[PDB]
Design an enzyme around this catalytic site. Structure first.
Site, PDB file in Angstrom:
ATOM      1  N   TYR A  38       0.799  -1.231   0.000  1.00 20.87           N
ATOM      2  CA  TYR A  38       0.000   0.000   0.000  1.00 20.87           C
ATOM      3  C   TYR A  38       0.826   1.272   0.000  1.00 20.87           C
ATOM      4  O   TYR A  38       1.979   1.276   0.408  1.00 20.87           O
ATOM      5  CB  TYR A  38      -0.963   0.025   1.204  1.00 20.87           C
ATOM      6  CG  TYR A  38      -0.243   0.182   2.510  1.00 20.87           C
ATOM      7  CD1 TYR A  38       0.153   1.442   2.965  1.00 20.87           C
ATOM      8  CD2 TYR A  38       0.068  -0.922   3.288  1.00 20.87           C
ATOM      9  CE1 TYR A  38       0.833   1.589   4.172  1.00 20.87           C
ATOM     10  CE2 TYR A  38       0.746  -0.783   4.489  1.00 20.87           C
ATOM     11  CZ  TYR A  38       1.122   0.470   4.921  1.00 20.87           C
ATOM     12  OH  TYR A  38       1.802   0.604   6.109  1.00 20.87           O
ATOM     13  N   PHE A  49       2.555   9.484   3.680  1.00 18.60           N
ATOM     14  CA  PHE A  49       2.876   9.256   5.090  1.00 18.60           C
ATOM     15  C   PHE A  49       3.392   7.841   5.349  1.00 18.60           C
ATOM     16  O   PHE A  49       4.001   7.580   6.399  1.00 18.60           O
ATOM     17  CB  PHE A  49       1.694   9.586   6.028  1.00 18.60           C
ATOM     18  CG  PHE A  49       0.419   8.838   5.723  1.00 18.60           C
ATOM     19  CD1 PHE A  49       0.188   7.580   6.262  1.00 18.60           C
ATOM     20  CD2 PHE A  49      -0.577   9.417   4.930  1.00 18.60           C
ATOM     21  CE1 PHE A  49      -1.003   6.892   5.991  1.00 18.60           C
ATOM     22  CE2 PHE A  49      -1.761   8.742   4.663  1.00 18.60           C
ATOM     23  CZ  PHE A  49      -1.970   7.477   5.192  1.00 18.60           C
ATOM     24  N   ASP A  50       3.126   6.935   4.407  1.00 17.12           N
ATOM     25  CA  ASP A  50       3.494   5.544   4.567  1.00 17.12           C
ATOM     26  C   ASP A  50       3.503   4.790   3.248  1.00 17.12           C
ATOM     27  O   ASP A  50       2.614   4.948   2.400  1.00 17.12           O
ATOM     28  CB  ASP A  50       2.552   4.843   5.552  1.00 17.12           C
ATOM     29  CG  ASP A  50       3.139   3.546   6.105  1.00 17.12           C
ATOM     30  OD1 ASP A  50       4.341   3.278   5.870  1.00 17.12           O
ATOM     31  OD2 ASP A  50       2.406   2.789   6.778  1.00 17.12           O
ATOM     32  N   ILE A  69      -7.360   0.139  10.238  1.00 15.82           N
ATOM     33  CA  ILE A  69      -8.396   1.168  10.141  1.00 15.82           C
ATOM     34  C   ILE A  69      -9.641   0.625   9.451  1.00 15.82           C
ATOM     35  O   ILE A  69      -9.550  -0.276   8.613  1.00 15.82           O
ATOM     36  CB  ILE A  69      -7.876   2.426   9.434  1.00 15.82           C
ATOM     37  CG1 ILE A  69      -7.403   2.101   8.023  1.00 15.82           C
ATOM     38  CG2 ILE A  69      -6.755   3.078  10.262  1.00 15.82           C
ATOM     39  CD1 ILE A  69      -6.900   3.292   7.288  1.00 15.82           C
ATOM     40  N   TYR A  95      -8.565   7.856  11.069  1.00  9.01           N
ATOM     41  CA  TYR A  95      -8.035   8.156  12.399  1.00  9.01           C
ATOM     42  C   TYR A  95      -8.871   9.176  13.187  1.00  9.01           C
ATOM     43  O   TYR A  95      -8.545   9.532  14.324  1.00  9.01           O
ATOM     44  CB  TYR A  95      -6.559   8.561  12.291  1.00  9.01           C
ATOM     45  CG  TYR A  95      -5.695   7.364  11.968  1.00  9.01           C
ATOM     46  CD1 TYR A  95      -5.441   6.391  12.943  1.00  9.01           C
ATOM     47  CD2 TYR A  95      -5.172   7.166  10.688  1.00  9.01           C
ATOM     48  CE1 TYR A  95      -4.687   5.268  12.666  1.00  9.01           C
ATOM     49  CE2 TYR A  95      -4.406   6.037  10.403  1.00  9.01           C
ATOM     50  CZ  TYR A  95      -4.174   5.098  11.404  1.00  9.01           C
ATOM     51  OH  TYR A  95      -3.427   3.974  11.165  1.00  9.01           O
ATOM     52  N   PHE A 112      -5.353   5.819  -0.117  1.00 14.61           N
ATOM     53  CA  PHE A 112      -4.462   4.691  -0.274  1.00 14.61           C
ATOM     54  C   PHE A 112      -4.491   4.158  -1.678  1.00 14.61           C
ATOM     55  O   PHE A 112      -5.528   4.183  -2.349  1.00 14.61           O
ATOM     56  CB  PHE A 112      -4.811   3.558   0.684  1.00 14.61           C
ATOM     57  CG  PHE A 112      -4.448   3.838   2.095  1.00 14.61           C
ATOM     58  CD1 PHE A 112      -3.178   3.550   2.561  1.00 14.61           C
ATOM     59  CD2 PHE A 112      -5.367   4.389   2.965  1.00 14.61           C
ATOM     60  CE1 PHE A 112      -2.833   3.805   3.869  1.00 14.61           C
ATOM     61  CE2 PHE A 112      -5.022   4.649   4.283  1.00 14.61           C
ATOM     62  CZ  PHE A 112      -3.760   4.363   4.732  1.00 14.61           C
TER      63      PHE A 112
END
Ligand SMILES: CCc1ccccc1NC(=O)CSc1nc2cccnc2[nH]1
Length: 123
Positions: A38, A49-50, A69, A95, A112
């Protein structure tokens, strides 16, 4: 191309980029160990962020069992093996009002890309 509304709420909105492998043994079922790759960006700034790709470590989790999540649970329980999707996940399914540390401010729309690599029938 294909745009799927995953919640009646409109909270999770998925766009299929690559159709998954067709057939039944290819669509993962609740409680299965899912393995995904992802990329997570913030809709606001388009900042990553990731990235599991960038760390070269696929993410494994047990589907719909509350580990990740809610956007992810919903999204992933709607995919075929080898499907790539874009999922717009609204803060509620993400979040929420708190956010998550520095990377992710409170009330943040999450974008995502998610690839479903495989799945075992585990726990
Ligand atoms: C702490 C994150 C976490 C802990 C336990 C289980 C799953 C996750 N991540 C996600 O569900 C979605 S992916 C993700 N969520 C993130 C929040 C902050 C930084 N990086 C993140 N990557």
């Amino acid at each position: 191309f294909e745009k799927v509304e995953l919640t009646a709420d409109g909270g999770v909105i998925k766009t299929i980029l690559k159709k998954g492998d067709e057939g039944e043994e290819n669509i993962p079922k609740k409680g299965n160990e899912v393995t995904v790759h992802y990329v997570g960006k913030l809709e606001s700034t388009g900042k990553v962020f990731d990235s599991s790709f960038d760390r070269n470590v696929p993410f494994k989790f047990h589907l719909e069992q509350g580990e990740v999540i809610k956007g992810w649970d919903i999204c992933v329980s709607s995919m075929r093996k080898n499907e790539k999707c874009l999922v717009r996940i609204e803060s509620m399914y993400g979040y929420g009002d708190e956010g998550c540390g520095e990377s992710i401010p409170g009330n943040s729309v999450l974008l995502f890309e998610i690839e479903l690599l495989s799945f075992r029938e585990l726990e």
